[PDB]
Design a protein around this nucleic acid. Structure first.
Ligand SMILES: [K+]
Ligand SMILES: [K+]
Ligand SMILES: [K+]
Ligand SMILES: [K+]
Ligand SMILES: [Mg+2]
Ligand SMILES: [Mg+2]
Ligand SMILES: [Mg+2]
Ligand SMILES: [Mg+2]
Ligand SMILES: [Mg+2]
Ligand SMILES: [Mg+2]
Ligand SMILES: [Mg+2]
Ligand SMILES: [Mg+2]
Ligand SMILES: [Mg+2]
Ligand SMILES: [Mg+2]
Ligand SMILES: [Mg+2]
Ligand SMILES: [Mg+2]
Ligand SMILES: [Mg+2]
Ligand SMILES: [Mg+2]
Ligand SMILES: [Mg+2]
Ligand SMILES: [Mg+2]
Ligand SMILES: [Mg+2]
Ligand SMILES: [Mg+2]
Ligand SMILES: [Mg+2]
Ligand SMILES: [Mg+2]
Ligand SMILES: [Mg+2]
Ligand SMILES: [Mg+2]
Ligand SMILES: [Mg+2]
Ligand SMILES: [Mg+2]
Ligand SMILES: [Mg+2]
Ligand SMILES: [Mg+2]
Ligand SMILES: [Mg+2]
Ligand SMILES: [Mg+2]
Ligand SMILES: [Mg+2]
Ligand SMILES: [Mg+2]
Ligand SMILES: [Mg+2]
Ligand SMILES: [Mg+2]
Lengths: 209, 203, 53, 53, 95, 98, 144
RNA sequence: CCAAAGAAGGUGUUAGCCCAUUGAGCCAUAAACCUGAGCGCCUCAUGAAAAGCGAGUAGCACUGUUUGGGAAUGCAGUGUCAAGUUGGCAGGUAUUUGUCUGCCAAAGUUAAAUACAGAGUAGGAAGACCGAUAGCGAACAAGUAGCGUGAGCGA
RNA sequence: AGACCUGAGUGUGGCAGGACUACCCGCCGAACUUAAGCAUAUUACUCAGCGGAGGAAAAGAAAACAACCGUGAUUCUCUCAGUGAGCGGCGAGCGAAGAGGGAACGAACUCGUUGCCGAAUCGGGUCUUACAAGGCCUUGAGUUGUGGCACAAAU
């Protein structure tokens, strides 16, 4: 009596189980709530230690790769030296200011650089730089009142200064134009797809003629 | 600089003059011991590329290893079990001879830290590598930021754990991404990642 | 995981006029040849020992 | 405002912002005696909503 | 001892095998009289010692080196490549 | 400078339309720049040392006139066709400079 | 829970529902999927046809992200149009604009009758969907 | 009668008030750690105002092994072995051509998130677990008595 | 005579040796078992064996992904995914990687090389309270090259 079942592929033929003869290969999560509490405690202790600096450094906005996620936005690793230059900042100094720097990420378009430069402008406008010697204030440093004002950003993503990542706004309701009524969209898309799909064979048949 | 001329000369290893020099050197090394201390490296350019400095506390040893494939040490060439595991002569050691020489030098002189090694000569019977070693107790080593790290206790016998360049070579750490996904950080680490059974608390 | 099994117990086989349960090896003690490894044995391992997963 | 009620044996404290079913129905039996402060009582429309809001 | 036999046999084996011109050119050396003259001229223009340089830098503290031969493989090679060297002297037994 | 995209998921210049920036200068661009000093050092060393046995065989092949055989020999010794072409070109240049 | 299993009911039955004759033995038919072509052929053949053999070309490094192409039908476009947007929508007037890729769809399919006319921005579209959505007074806008 | 203390241990029966406990707080302190990179003195340091970049290497061949890696994922032995003047590597079906993208191997150091699947030190918190044939072999002068030539076995 | 090179012998100052080894790193490496037989396969790149370190180790700073509107060291988590990948007497069975949500992250640096310098270096004595990242002295090492400045976060 086996009957009509799924064919099993449970994948448990190795010595995963801890027994008298086997140490086993397992990973339980019985420490998960304790580890979550430990992480929050460590974040609070770190925030108290680096006060008044925001706990998370500033990160840029990037576009998620691949055609599945290219409509999504997230925080990148660090601001490029081109964005930092366009914001009027030296990258080595920006690293000390609390801005993450990534020299690997190239700016292949103007929009991403503009978004990150706006983030940098807003951050430097909201930045309160403490003087190295408060008895001798320099250009760009804060005053006694601002230093006393202090206050610390404890946001999860270090985004209080610059907000969350900005998505393009939705298009407002509109009226269909005469061209949109007339045009055959499927034919246009299909011919554009065929232009690349049969490009090699079309070019080969272009030869021999 | 002079380095360019030395390096280009050492890229012409099969030329007549280099073959003559290597013939004389190979004869000399054949009539020497398995481990030989050297006052100065045979290839100063290669040694300095690999981290050797002409400073107190830097040592160069030349280590000889025998060539050929590994012979499985079973009595009278008799294996048991499946015929899959019946080979005696055709098997190869999964660690290169450079790492073997580094480990021999390291296990012989346990008061030194192995830094790197380079190929110096080859023969029909032997291969020679010159191993760079550092004295952790030398003041020049301990007060020099460049080589200061090797005094730390985590670098004791790093050749025995495969952390040297030859060890990294035979561990597959020369590659990244899709060529080394199952090799990183090590085979054991990836095997633990891919084979431990995970029990989430709520499931 | 080792709670009933820290012995070199082996069955004696048939022909000795005793049950075929594995028994503690050696001599000189009161556990010598005393039956082992079974959930029905005095110092043996429980049936289906409990797990933390 | 729980300083005076902590040590009272037989009086359990609660926060309206986190109501526990294990305390609202001890043993799975509904119908627990609950004392409401006016400020916590007035938040029940916001916290749990209504049939329409 | 082994090292004595090895050095003697090494000289023998270098004499016995066919030595390519790149290595054989170092066997043919400058004449003894010309070698003595070149060594004397270099001796006259020897670089400053540690004490001489220390005294000169102490003297200059109340406010470069004198002309000398270029020594050291890196500096001599740089002098040769830039063609600043009027004459270069090379040893025949560098190992 | 880069070709703008058409805003269509398909076609020759498919893709979302952004204002593309040109490729920026990189320190890696010098790898495709002629290395004159390295060439001079290599020529000096090659003149000093002579020829490889592989180079002698290829030069005899080229003097005889079996270019295809020289290319096959270089391919077998070096393992790649591009390297074989380069080595045969080097030996032909060496022969011309004689 | 252990008190609901057949084990509790079978205390004192001496066989636990495995019989006196056949008995409960370790592996009377092999382990797992053994014998799919020998002594388990009928089960595999009538319950899992097509299990053995090969079919089709190979795709060595398959990536799901380039292949991402979820689809939505015309008669399900109200799921993306809001309530007041749907209420104020008719032919020749101001129409809601639906951004498919922001809503998680790539291609627009033409099944059913479109309820509320709208302007759809889609990466792909079927010819029937395009024809129907134009006949209803809406439109399709290609996007990448 | 206390309760900002109801905390669960002890005391001759079941103890908030018999005891210990259960707080705010006080005293002391080698260095190290934290505090306008705490605050002085001497000394010592210190800020700004053209070329080419890792060679028995990488590749190929054969053989072995390993991998999901499949005309060969990584590695090993031997053979023989580069390029850098239009370079090299990767782009998961072999070859020869082109065109595009990334990236620049063959030297090295680096915290934190991660493990502790029969470790250890100093402390803690416990448990819908076991309750002396159970739970560790061992709640006891237990790896003890005892056995074996021995490895070991072992109450 | 003497020098250099290559090797010895003593004095002086140090280090290695064993233990631990639960996790971690390198090598070596089975069979029982499953396939209802069994040889490839599986168990398993596991057990046993040898070597090595730490409080974590290992990895780590692109000769990386990808093919995007692009991302951006390493590690780990959920997912990807028991997979319309793939490997398999294509049988039994094995079987990952991009992307996306996250943890963590002041995360970056050091040589070699190439240019410009060329002992400015390092050890010893001795003095500054001081085996100073200091000053003086020292052929003692070192020019068969120690050290400084510049190399895309640069100008
Ligand atoms: K055999
Ligand atoms: K087998
Ligand atoms: K309390
Ligand atoms: K090889
Ligand atoms: Mg056991
Ligand atoms: Mg200050
Ligand atoms: Mg991973
Ligand atoms: Mg027991
Ligand atoms: Mg009965
Ligand atoms: Mg039944
Ligand atoms: Mg039956
Ligand atoms: Mg077929
Ligand atoms: Mg009591
Ligand atoms: Mg201060
Ligand atoms: Mg390189
Ligand atoms: Mg090679
Ligand atoms: Mg295998
Ligand atoms: Mg490391
Ligand atoms: Mg522990
Ligand atoms: Mg007991
Ligand atoms: Mg007992
Ligand atoms: Mg040891
Ligand atoms: Mg088993
Ligand atoms: Mg079988
Ligand atoms: Mg059977
Ligand atoms: Mg059998
Ligand atoms: Mg395996
Ligand atoms: Mg083991
Ligand atoms: Mg330890
Ligand atoms: Mg480490
Ligand atoms: Mg990454
Ligand atoms: Mg899934
Ligand atoms: Mg699924
Ligand atoms: Mg496997
Ligand atoms: Mg992520
Ligand atoms: Mg240098």
């Amino acid at each position: 009596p086996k009957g009509n079942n799924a064919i099993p592929h449970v994948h448990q033929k190795k010595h995963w189980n801890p027994c008298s003869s086997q140490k086993g290969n397992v990973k339980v999560f019985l420490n998960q709530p304790a580890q979550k509490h430990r992480r929050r405690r460590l974040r609070l202790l770190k925030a108290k230690k680096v006060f008044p600096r925001p706990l998370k450094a500033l990160r840029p906005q990037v576009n998620c790769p691949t055609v599945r996620h290219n409509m999504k936005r997230r925080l990148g690793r660090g601001f490029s030296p081109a964005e930092l230059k366009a914001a009027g900042l030296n990258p080595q100094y920006a690293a000390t200011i609390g801005i993450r720097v990534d020299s690997r990420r190239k700016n292949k378009s103007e929009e991403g650089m503009n978004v990150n430069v706006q983030r940098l402008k807003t951050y430097m406008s909201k930045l309160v730089l403490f003087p190295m010697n408060h008895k001798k204030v320099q250009k760009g440093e804060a005053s006694e009142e601002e230093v006393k004002a202090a206050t610390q950003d404890r946001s999860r993503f270090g985004d209080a200064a610059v907000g969350a990542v900005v998505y393009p706004s939705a298009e407002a309701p509109r009226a269909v134009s005469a061209e949109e009524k007339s045009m055959c969209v499927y034919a246009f898309l299909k011919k554009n797809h065929s232009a690349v799909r049969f490009f090699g064979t079309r070019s080969s048949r272009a030869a021999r003629k | 600089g002079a380095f360019m001329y030395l390096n280009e000369l050492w890229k012409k290893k099969s030329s007549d003059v280099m073959r003559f020099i290597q013939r004389i050197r190979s004869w000399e090394f054949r009539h020497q011991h398995t481990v030989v201390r050297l006052r100065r490296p045979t290839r100063p350019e290669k040694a300095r590329m690999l981290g050797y400095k002409t400073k107190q506390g830097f040592c160069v040893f030349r280590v000889r290893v025998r060539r050929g494939g590994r012979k499985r040490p079973v009595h009278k060439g008799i294996t048991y079990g499946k015929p899959k595991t019946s080979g005696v002569l055709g098997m190869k050691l999964n660690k290169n001879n450079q790492a073997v020489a580094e480990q021999r030098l390291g296990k012989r002189f346990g008061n030194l830290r192995v830094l790197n090694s380079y190929w110096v000569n080859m023969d029909s019977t032997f291969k020679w590598y010159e191993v760079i070693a550092v004295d952790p107790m030398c003041k020049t080593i301990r007060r020099d930021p460049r080589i200061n790290w090797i005094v730390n206790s985590v670098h004791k016998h790093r050749e025995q754990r495969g952390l040297t360049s030859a060890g990294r070579k035979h561990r597959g750490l020369r590659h990244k991404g899709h060529k080394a996904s199952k090799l990183r950080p090590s085979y054991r680490a990836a095997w633990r990642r891919n084979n431990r059974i995970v029990f989430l608390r709520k499931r | 995981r080792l709670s009933g099994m820290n012995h070199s117990a082996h069955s004696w086989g048939t022909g000795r006029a005793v049950a075929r349960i594995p028994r503690i090896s050696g001599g000189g003690t009161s556990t010598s040849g005393a039956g082992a490894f079974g959930n029905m044995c005095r110092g043996g391992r429980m049936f289906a020992p409990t797990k933390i997963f | 405002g729980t300083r005076a009620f902590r040590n009272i044996f037989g009086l359990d404290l609660a926060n309206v912002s986190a109501l526990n079913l294990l305390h609202l129905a001890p043993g799975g039996h509904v119908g627990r005696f609950v004392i409401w402060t006016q400020s916590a009582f007035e938040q029940l429309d916001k916290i749990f909503g209504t049939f329409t809001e | 001892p082994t090292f004595v036999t090895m050095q003697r046999k090494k000289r023998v084996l270098q004499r016995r095998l066919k030595v390519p011109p790149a290595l054989n050119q170092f066997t043919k050396v400058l004449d003894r009289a010309s070698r003595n003259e070149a060594l004397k001229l270099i001796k006259k223009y020897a670089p400053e010692t540690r004490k001489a340089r220390r005294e000169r830098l102490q003297k200059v503290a109340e406010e470069k080196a004198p002309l000398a031969v270029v020594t050291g493989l890196q500096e001599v090679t740089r002098a040769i490549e830039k063609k600043q060297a009027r004459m270069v002297v090379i040893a025949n037994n560098v190992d | 400078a880069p070709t703008p995209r058409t805003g269509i998921i398909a076609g020759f210049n498919k893709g979302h339309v952004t204002t593309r920036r040109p490729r920026q200068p990189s320190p890696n661009d010098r790898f495709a720049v002629p290395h004159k000093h390295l060439r001079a050092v290599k020529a000096i060393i090659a003149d000093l040392v002579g020829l490889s046995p592989l180079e002698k065989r290829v030069q005899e092949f080229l003097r005889v006139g079996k270019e295809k055989r020289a290319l096959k020999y270089c391919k077998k010794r070096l393992g790649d066709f591009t390297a074989a072409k380069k080595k045969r070109s080097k030996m032909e240049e060496a022969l011309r400079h004689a | 829970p252990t008190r609901f299993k057949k084990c509790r009911h079978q205390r004192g039955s001496t066989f636990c529902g495995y019989g006196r004759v056949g008995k409960h033995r370790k592996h009377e038919s092999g382990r797992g999927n053994a014998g799919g072509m020998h002594h388990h052929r009928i089960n595999f053949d009538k319950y899992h046809p097509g299990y053995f053999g090969k079919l089709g070309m190979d795709h060595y490094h398959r990536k799901k992200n380039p292949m991402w192409k979820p689809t939505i039908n015309l008669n399900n476009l109200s799921r993306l149009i809001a309530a007041e947007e749907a209420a104020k929508a008719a032919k020749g007037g101001t129409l809601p604009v639906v951004d498919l890729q922001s809503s998680g769809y790539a291609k627009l399919l033409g099944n059913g009758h479109i309820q509320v006319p709208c302007i759809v921005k889609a990466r792909y579209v079927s010819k029937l969907a395009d024809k129907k959505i134009r006949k209803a007074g809406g439109a399709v806008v290609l996007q990448a």
